[PDB]
Design a protein around this motif. Sequence first.
Motif, PDB file in Angstrom:
ATOM      1  N   UNK A 617      42.375  15.802 -18.397  1.00  0.00           N
ATOM      2  CA  UNK A 617      43.781  15.927 -18.018  1.00  0.00           C
ATOM      3  C   UNK A 617      43.989  15.644 -16.531  1.00  0.00           C
ATOM      4  N   UNK A 618      43.044  16.068 -15.683  1.00  0.00           N
ATOM      5  CA  UNK A 618      43.153  15.828 -14.242  1.00  0.00           C
ATOM      6  C   UNK A 618      42.973  14.349 -13.915  1.00  0.00           C
ATOM      7  N   UNK A 619      41.923  13.737 -14.477  1.00  0.00           N
ATOM      8  CA  UNK A 619      41.653  12.321 -14.245  1.00  0.00           C
ATOM      9  C   UNK A 619      42.830  11.457 -14.680  1.00  0.00           C
ATOM     10  N   UNK A 620      43.429  11.791 -15.831  1.00  0.00           N
ATOM     11  CA  UNK A 620      44.597  11.064 -16.319  1.00  0.00           C
ATOM     12  C   UNK A 620      45.843  11.371 -15.499  1.00  0.00           C
ATOM     13  N   UNK A 621      45.948  12.591 -14.968  1.00  0.00           N
ATOM     14  CA  UNK A 621      47.108  12.934 -14.161  1.00  0.00           C
ATOM     15  C   UNK A 621      47.153  12.095 -12.893  1.00  0.00           C
ATOM     16  N   UNK A 622      46.004  11.931 -12.223  1.00  0.00           N
ATOM     17  CA  UNK A 622      46.007  11.114 -11.009  1.00  0.00           C
ATOM     18  C   UNK A 622      46.169   9.641 -11.348  1.00  0.00           C
ATOM     19  N   UNK A 623      45.772   9.220 -12.554  1.00  0.00           N
ATOM     20  CA  UNK A 623      45.908   7.804 -12.893  1.00  0.00           C
ATOM     21  C   UNK A 623      47.371   7.407 -13.048  1.00  0.00           C
ATOM     22  N   UNK A 624      48.112   8.124 -13.896  1.00  0.00           N
ATOM     23  CA  UNK A 624      49.482   7.747 -14.219  1.00  0.00           C
ATOM     24  C   UNK A 624      50.522   8.205 -13.197  1.00  0.00           C
ATOM     25  N   UNK A 625      50.172   9.092 -12.262  1.00  0.00           N
ATOM     26  CA  UNK A 625      51.137   9.577 -11.264  1.00  0.00           C
ATOM     27  C   UNK A 625      51.827   8.403 -10.571  1.00  0.00           C
ATOM     28  N   UNK A 626      53.137   8.513 -10.371  1.00  0.00           N
ATOM     29  CA  UNK A 626      53.916   7.373  -9.905  1.00  0.00           C
ATOM     30  C   UNK A 626      53.576   7.068  -8.451  1.00  0.00           C
ATOM     31  N   UNK A 627      53.114   5.832  -8.216  1.00  0.00           N
ATOM     32  CA  UNK A 627      52.723   5.352  -6.889  1.00  0.00           C
ATOM     33  C   UNK A 627      53.909   4.940  -6.022  1.00  0.00           C
ATOM     34  N   UNK A 628      54.949   4.355  -6.622  1.00  0.00           N
ATOM     35  CA  UNK A 628      56.147   3.900  -5.904  1.00  0.00           C
ATOM     36  C   UNK A 628      55.720   2.861  -4.867  1.00  0.00           C
ATOM     37  N   UNK A 629      55.941   3.075  -3.563  1.00  0.00           N
ATOM     38  CA  UNK A 629      55.570   2.069  -2.565  1.00  0.00           C
ATOM     39  C   UNK A 629      54.060   1.892  -2.426  1.00  0.00           C
ATOM     40  N   UNK A 630      53.291   2.942  -2.647  1.00  0.00           N
ATOM     41  CA  UNK A 630      51.873   2.981  -2.312  1.00  0.00           C
ATOM     42  C   UNK A 630      51.008   2.434  -3.447  1.00  0.00           C
ATOM     43  N   UNK A 631      49.725   2.149  -3.178  1.00  0.00           N
ATOM     44  CA  UNK A 631      48.858   1.572  -4.216  1.00  0.00           C
ATOM     45  C   UNK A 631      48.453   2.581  -5.284  1.00  0.00           C
ATOM     46  N   UNK A 632      47.928   2.034  -6.384  1.00  0.00           N
ATOM     47  CA  UNK A 632      47.391   2.831  -7.483  1.00  0.00           C
ATOM     48  C   UNK A 632      46.074   3.490  -7.081  1.00  0.00           C
ATOM     49  N   UNK A 633      45.841   4.696  -7.588  1.00  0.00           N
ATOM     50  CA  UNK A 633      44.778   5.562  -7.103  1.00  0.00           C
ATOM     51  C   UNK A 633      43.975   6.105  -8.273  1.00  0.00           C
ATOM     52  N   UNK A 634      42.671   6.307  -8.047  1.00  0.00           N
ATOM     53  CA  UNK A 634      41.742   6.764  -9.075  1.00  0.00           C
ATOM     54  C   UNK A 634      40.854   7.890  -8.555  1.00  0.00           C
ATOM     55  N   UNK A 635      40.546   8.881  -9.400  1.00  0.00           N
ATOM     56  CA  UNK A 635      39.568   9.900  -9.019  1.00  0.00           C
ATOM     57  C   UNK A 635      38.397   9.904  -9.994  1.00  0.00           C
ATOM     58  N   UNK A 636      37.236  10.296  -9.476  1.00  0.00           N
ATOM     59  CA  UNK A 636      36.010  10.468 -10.245  1.00  0.00           C
ATOM     60  C   UNK A 636      35.596  11.925 -10.131  1.00  0.00           C
ATOM     61  N   UNK A 637      35.432  12.575 -11.281  1.00  0.00           N
ATOM     62  CA  UNK A 637      35.285  14.021 -11.370  1.00  0.00           C
ATOM     63  C   UNK A 637      33.887  14.370 -11.855  1.00  0.00           C
ATOM     64  N   UNK A 638      33.209  15.227 -11.106  1.00  0.00           N
ATOM     65  CA  UNK A 638      32.047  15.926 -11.597  1.00  0.00           C
ATOM     66  C   UNK A 638      32.421  17.315 -12.096  1.00  0.00           C
ATOM     67  N   UNK A 639      31.558  17.868 -12.935  1.00  0.00           N
ATOM     68  CA  UNK A 639      31.818  19.153 -13.573  1.00  0.00           C
ATOM     69  C   UNK A 639      30.539  19.963 -13.605  1.00  0.00           C
ATOM     70  N   UNK A 640      30.672  21.265 -13.380  1.00  0.00           N
ATOM     71  CA  UNK A 640      29.550  22.178 -13.517  1.00  0.00           C
ATOM     72  C   UNK A 640      30.019  23.408 -14.280  1.00  0.00           C
ATOM     73  N   UNK A 641      29.066  24.089 -14.913  1.00  0.00           N
ATOM     74  CA  UNK A 641      29.332  25.286 -15.697  1.00  0.00           C
ATOM     75  C   UNK A 641      28.432  26.408 -15.195  1.00  0.00           C
ATOM     76  N   UNK A 642      28.896  27.648 -15.343  1.00  0.00           N
ATOM     77  CA  UNK A 642      28.094  28.806 -14.950  1.00  0.00           C
ATOM     78  C   UNK A 642      26.943  29.010 -15.928  1.00  0.00           C
TER      79      UNK A 642
END
Lengths: 673, 672
Positions: A617-642
């Motif tokens: 959900x986070x990776x997709x949220x940053x993908x589709x978020x409206x860029x408007x004037x600025x360029x398109x942006x991507x995040x790469x997520x690592x995950x850890x568990x207790x």
Amino acid sequence: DDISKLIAACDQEPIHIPNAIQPFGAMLIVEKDTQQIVYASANSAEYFSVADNTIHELSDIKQANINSLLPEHLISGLASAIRENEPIWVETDRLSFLGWRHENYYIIEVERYHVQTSNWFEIQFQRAFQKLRNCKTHNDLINTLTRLIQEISGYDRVMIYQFDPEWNGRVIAESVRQLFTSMLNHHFPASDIPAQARAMYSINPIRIIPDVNAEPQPLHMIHKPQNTEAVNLSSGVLRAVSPLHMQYLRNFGVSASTSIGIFNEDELWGIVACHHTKPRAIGRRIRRLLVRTVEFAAERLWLIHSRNVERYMVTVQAAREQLSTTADDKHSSHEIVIEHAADWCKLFRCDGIGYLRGEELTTYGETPDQTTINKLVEWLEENGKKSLFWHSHMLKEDAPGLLPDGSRFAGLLAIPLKSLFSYLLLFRVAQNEVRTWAGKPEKLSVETSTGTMLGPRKSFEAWQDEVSGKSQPWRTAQLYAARDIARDLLIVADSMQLNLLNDQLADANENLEKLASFDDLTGIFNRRRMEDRLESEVKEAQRYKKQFGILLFDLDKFKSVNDTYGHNIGDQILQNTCAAVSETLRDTDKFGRWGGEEFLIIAPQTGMPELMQLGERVRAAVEKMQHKDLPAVTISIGVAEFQNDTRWDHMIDRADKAMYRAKENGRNQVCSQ
Amino acid sequence: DDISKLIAACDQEPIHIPNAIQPFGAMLIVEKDTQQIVYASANSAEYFSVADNTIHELSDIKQANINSLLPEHLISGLASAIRENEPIWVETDRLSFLGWRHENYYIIEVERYHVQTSNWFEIQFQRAFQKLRNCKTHNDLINTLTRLIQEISGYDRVMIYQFDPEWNGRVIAESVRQLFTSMLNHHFPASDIPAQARAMYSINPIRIIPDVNAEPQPLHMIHKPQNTEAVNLSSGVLRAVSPLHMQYLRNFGVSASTSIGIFNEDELWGIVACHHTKPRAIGRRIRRLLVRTVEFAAERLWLIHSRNVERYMVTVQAAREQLSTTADDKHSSHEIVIEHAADWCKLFRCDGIGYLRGEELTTYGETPDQTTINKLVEWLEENGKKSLFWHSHMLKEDAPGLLPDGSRFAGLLAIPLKLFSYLLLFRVAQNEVRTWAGKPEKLSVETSTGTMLGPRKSFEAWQDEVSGKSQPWRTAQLYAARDIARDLLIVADSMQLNLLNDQLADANENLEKLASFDDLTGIFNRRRMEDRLESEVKEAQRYKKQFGILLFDLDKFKSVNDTYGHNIGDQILQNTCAAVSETLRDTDKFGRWGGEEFLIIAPQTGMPELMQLGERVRAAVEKMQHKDLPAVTISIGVAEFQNDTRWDHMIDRADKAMYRAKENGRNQVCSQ
Ligand SMILES: *C/C=C1/C(=C/c2[nH]c(/C=C3[NH+]=C(/C=C4\NC(=O)C(C=C)=C4C)C(C)=C\3CCC(=O)O)c(CCC(=O)O)c2C)NC(=O)[C@H]1C
Ligand SMILES: *C/C=C1/C(=C/c2[nH]c(/C=C3[NH+]=C(/C=C4\NC(=O)C(C=C)=C4C)C(C)=C\3CCC(=O)O)c(CCC(=O)O)c2C)NC(=O)[C@H]1C
Ligand SMILES: [Cl-]
Ligand SMILES: [Cl-]
């Protein structure tokens, strides 16, 4: 001021020792130790001839014995009396005796008497007391008093004459039968009743002048006294009247008078003045009746007064309750002043009110301008009067140079409220009281046995004068009410500012907390709060066997974004991505900025599969978020568990390796290891 | 409830219509419209035979005319008078008449009268007014009153008997002679004077029973009246006495009595009660004298009472002023309570005070423990009264379960101040021992009206005790205590305002510290650098000045943070700022730009001198002491003012140069 001197000379005539009596009786004066008669009124022989046959002329009294002229009961009473100036009343068939001891003398007055029998007097007392008891107002009492005194005495004019604090007086009630002009509310001057004259009522409450044109009878010496100084006649009723006052009464058109002092405890508060247009005697019983009635009406008037005070005090408390009930509704003290100052103007009998608090000044009614009000305030401080209140009913005189020229204010009551300054100000316009006096002022000199004095004026016709620059004086009950209102305002003002300061202190401490635990550019938690939160999440999970995981993400090829676009543009991207990520998160999760361009999410109450879901959900949220004037942006997520970890860095290392594997396998990914 | 009903039955006996009189006079009842005599007392014959030769028996009055028995003044007065029950007093040579119109009747009482001529009454009246006028306190007045009533009436025992709000009474003053036992401060129960008896004083203020054993004379009919209902005899003096009160007086050892109502406006406040060991008549003139004297003493006592309200208010205002003196002495309200609470206990006649403001509690005198005080406070809030104060003289009845079991406290006055804030004024129960004139006696007596409580047999002293009560809280004290409490509120409000002012000053000053400097390092925060840089560029653009910026960053600092810890990394930042700041010239400005990257603005410095400065800085961080912490390196970019518009362009130039230094070997200075 020559008239001031003339008036002052009035006090020269020694009215207690005239060495003469009015002719409606006779007088003997006896030495106590000598037992001899030393003085006798010049008409003594026409009275004591009843007691002793041989007495035909005055000269005879020299060879008479006192025990032949007095009833044995009067001799026994005088021999027995220790207290001085406490007269004894002993009567026979045809004579009524009044005798007392004064120093070494026995003074005996005798009047003609005849025994009447009736129940009239007792009925008059019952009727008078019933009527006085039923009086519930000031005006009712004094008018009923005037009616009773007139019915009892038969005098053609009776009037209640009240003294001022300067001894001037005014007729406040009046009952007139014959053709007198009404003297109600006319003012009379102090010189009309000198201090010695007012002091007599304190020795004998009644003064009786049965005939203004009756020649006074001098005292003649009979056996030479040991002392020779004139004997004090003050306790009796036969004491001759000053000729100045007889001519006064003639000029006033009065043939007979009787006056009774009205006492408030020991102070002469006024007199009941009675006039007749013809001669008029009053017996001892009517004298005693008039005096007892006035003494009763008096205490009734004091009780009416003291009660009106208590009831004012109740009204003040009701006003203060009115203030507190409205006070609990978040109003300022200035708002409360605006609502109730009209009531307060009635409460305090003032024309205007001004309240000071800080830079704000609230006025109601008639007030000076703001600048003059500050000149007043300043003068109150600079004068240095630490008094709880400062008050004057003649501002122009008590504090000169204080007001503007033509200003109409004469009264000021100022209550200081501690700090900077604050004050409660109560204003009274000068009341341009038109006073009607009984006669023009007359500076007339009159030659007398004592010297030169003021003569009684001839005209008593109405003459008006005006008093400017004065108000009613501030009564004590109003001082205390105003003080109490002022402090009830201070409590409202204090509560207001306490609340406001508490708001400012919470806001200031909240900004201190915001700058300590958030990140300037993004507004999310800075790394210190993330690190602390993660450390406690680890300790908690290890102690209580809870389940949580973390998301550690980074912006992809971000340096190329900065260099191609700019740092202003790059930061707009970081802010955008934080806004897009926060919409995905649940309220339990904590989101903060871990490094530049690197962010951390702590997801409590989350198992591993649900954790991967959140990363998607986070990776997709940053993908589709409206860029408007600025360029398109991507995040790469690592995950850890207790997984039963010791320290939180172990988790950050696991998540970092997973995140780096996400960067190698195509940047727009969620990876865990 | 057993005796309660009996006491209540006493109001059944109609004392206004006994159809009989006491025998010290005679009475007639005439119809107004008929003009006939319709009733006459049984001894009417021995009285009117004074007026009329012909009257020998009682029956003779039937053939009599009122114009033969009554003085002309009395008939004219009754025909003329409109108001009812307003008696007219007309005396002759041998008879004294008192008559009034009542409904459709004229009632006329006649007593034997002897003309006594003297000045006695006027002399006694003068002495009475002089002595009462000299009474300035409650106690002086009432005792002087009893002295005067005894001298005037000659009665052997005179008592001032004051009523409670429940009608019980107590003797509060007394003048008692030789044969009587003292009755001062004895309590009498309400049943001693039924409501009808108290009501009578409002109709006639004086009641006279000259002889407790005098056989009452009934009224006999004489002409058949139109109505026949018993005629009301309330306004006179001859009305026969309830036989219960006669036996009452006999048990009391009383042969004769007289009482005069003491009135406060229209309410009966007490009675002047007089007793004698022998029969005792009072003339009409001594009756008028006693009533007039009591009416004068009455108003005098009410004036003393109203004056002592005023004088109280003065003493309270003076106490509040004494408190205000401490208002400008910088003391807390808790200190103020400690200084003045002994004075307040006198002002409020209470044994103890407790003041609560915040977590703090101050007590003086007799108080419950803090625990009981908090149980009280809690009950006061849960009471929730909108009342300005709350007060009780008997706690166990008004608020049960609130105090401990064996507690002695009975009175509480509580002023709410507003968290919680309260002023509490405490009164220990006074274990007042009351001495009554006789035990309670449940004794029944059968009468023509029914069965009701009979007069008790013993009047000897019997004591009882009331526990769990204090003096009641007078209204003047409620308001005075509230005003003291609020005078304490102003002191607390001022203190709280001072401390809030200090705290807001410290917090706003720390906000100023954080407004321009960086918390961790003490260098200028980024906003202050941004501003300085923008204004420096504008200045250089106006006057063609030369300056440069140095943008440096810590090398592999993330590796240091993660390898070591949050504490070590921050100590490294503080070390490097300390080392760099000593390098700079006084004109240069040094601030913290990012988490790990810092900015230096070097005015009046061209590119060679700028490069030199970057080299001094790079060497300064290298030589710096590692101490416990690891060795650290910075890489510096450098930019120069080259006809720039905005600081945005400059920091971008410096950033590219600085990143160029990091890649080419981290410990370097670069310009681009
Ligand atoms: C320079 C002396 C003056 C003077 C002397 C004087 N006056 C009195 C006594 C009385 N003056 C009274 C005045 C009034 N009578 C009224 O009816 C009114 C108005 C309501 C006033 C103001 C009164 C009442 C008395 C008391 C006697 C009385 O009842 O008439 C004395 C004392 C005389 C005495 O009592 O032996 C003296 C010495 N009065 C002046 O006006 C100047 C001239
Ligand atoms: C159940 C009815 C009762 C009753 C009736 C009753 N009592 C009176 C009159 C009086 N009782 C008085 C009581 C006192 N006199 C004292 O000196 C003291 C102690 C200080 C007390 C308590 C008084 C004063 C009166 C008024 C007569 C008087 O002045 O003596 C009446 C009325 C009588 C009348 O006037 O017709 C009645 C109906 N008394 C009881 O004890 C029970 C039996
Ligand atoms: Cl006289
Ligand atoms: Cl009577």
